[PDB]
Structure formats: C-alpha cells, structure tokens
Amino acid sequence: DSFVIRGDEVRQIAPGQTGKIADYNYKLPDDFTGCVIAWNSNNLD
Amino acid sequence: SALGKLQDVVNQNAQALNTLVKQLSSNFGAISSVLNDILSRLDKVEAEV
Structure with a gap:
C-alpha cells in the first residue's frame, strides 16, 4: 500500500x-501481519 | 449431631459452589471484574490483554 499523510x-x-484516518480513511486488521514504513518528505512533496 | 455426615456433604457442596460464584467478582489484575466495564472503557487491544 502507498499514500501520503501529515x-x-x-x-x-x-x-x-x-x-x-483509522475510522474513515485507512485501517489495518486486528491480525495485521506486515510492516509499516514511513518518512517525512518535506523536501519532495 | 448424630446425622452430621449427610449435613456435611450438603454443606461442602454449597460452600464449593458459593466459592465458585464469589470468584466471579475477583479482578485477577484486570482493571475490573465487571466485564462490560473493561470493554466500554478501554481500546480493543488493551481490553483483550
């Protein structure tokens, strides 16, 4: 999955x-089996 | 007091069942033994733990 957030x-x-965000945009399962990878992008976005 | 054996077998079973009922009220380290007052109070991960 890919997106941008504040x-x-x-x-x-x-x-x-x-x-x-969790209720009304994007939600991960109670048994979510994965990794979340994130960085600030202030010099790019 | 002559009939004590039979009365004691009734007493022991009543005492065991009353103990098993009273233990529903024990917290076991959870925030409260009132099960709905975990669920209605915490977030789901905290409530499950």
Whole structure:
C-alpha cells in the first residue's frame, strides 16, 4: 500500500487504532501481519 | 449431631459452589471484574490483554 499523510497522523497507521484516518480513511486488521514504513518528505512533496 | 455426615456433604457442596460464584467478582489484575466495564472503557487491544 502507498499514500501520503501529515506527520501528526502517522500513529493511526497501525492495527487496533482509533481516530479519523483509522475510522474513515485507512485501517489495518486486528491480525495485521506486515510492516509499516514511513518518512517525512518535506523536501519532495 | 448424630446425622452430621449427610449435613456435611450438603454443606461442602454449597460452600464449593458459593466459592465458585464469589470468584466471579475477583479482578485477577484486570482493571475490573465487571466485564462490560473493561470493554466500554478501554481500546480493543488493551481490553483483550
């Protein structure tokens, strides 16, 4: 999966989370078997 | 007191079942033994743990 979010939102990209991204945009399963990879892109985006 | 054996077998079973009921109230280190007051209070990962 690939997307961009503001730096405040990144904690929502995890299993079992609550918040507007987790509820209404993008959600990971309770048995999510994977890795989350992220970086700031302020010199690019 | 002559009939004590039979009365004691009733007493022991009542005492065992009452102990098994009273143990529903014990917390075992969880925030409360009222099961809905874990679920209604915590986030799902914390509630499951």
